[PDB]
Design a protein around this ligand. Sequence first.
Ligand SMILES: C[C@@H](CN)N1CCc2sccc2C1
Lengths: 39, 156
Amino acid sequence: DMYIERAGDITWEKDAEVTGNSPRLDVALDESGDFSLVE
Amino acid sequence: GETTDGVYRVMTRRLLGSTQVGVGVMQEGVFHTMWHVTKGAALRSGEGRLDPYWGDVKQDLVSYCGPWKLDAAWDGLSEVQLLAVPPGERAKNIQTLPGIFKTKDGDIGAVALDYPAGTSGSPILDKCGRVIGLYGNGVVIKNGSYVSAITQGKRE
Ligand SMILES: C[C@@H](CN)N1CCc2sccc2C1
């Protein structure tokens, strides 16, 4: 039995921590909604 | 129950203690999350019940109480923020420049940030605070790192 609990507002925050790269990937999406890498 | 717009944790008491299985967005009276978080089950909000209204396994999305309301899109150029809501931890904004998933049916933005599975459904936002998609359906690349699609629904 699942339940929900509020965790915050949805707002852009100035000076948030900035990280993560920006990879360009060839992918395939199957009928079950799973993504896989195409090589 | 609580109908205020915002980001919410999705919890279950079926396992050990109270476990966070995902996250979602309440907007215009509709609850939005990824299909793999709830498997399309009904949800509770206080003494109230939220019933599924639309869902699609291939898109990995589901809406409750009404049709999918989120229609903003990544502009393809700007940094975005993941409003990460990890299990047992405070909501935190992380800014990043999305990468791209290139598919046979078109290109999708993707965010290279790694959080626990219970963070699935956390919203990705643009500089106006609009939700451009949900985090949590993606792939594991060569170096073992996780990259999530920016998954967005269609507003009918
Ligand atoms: C470690 C990787 C393995 N694919 N995963 C599991 C599934 C999800 S949904 C959000 C984050 C994660 C992290």
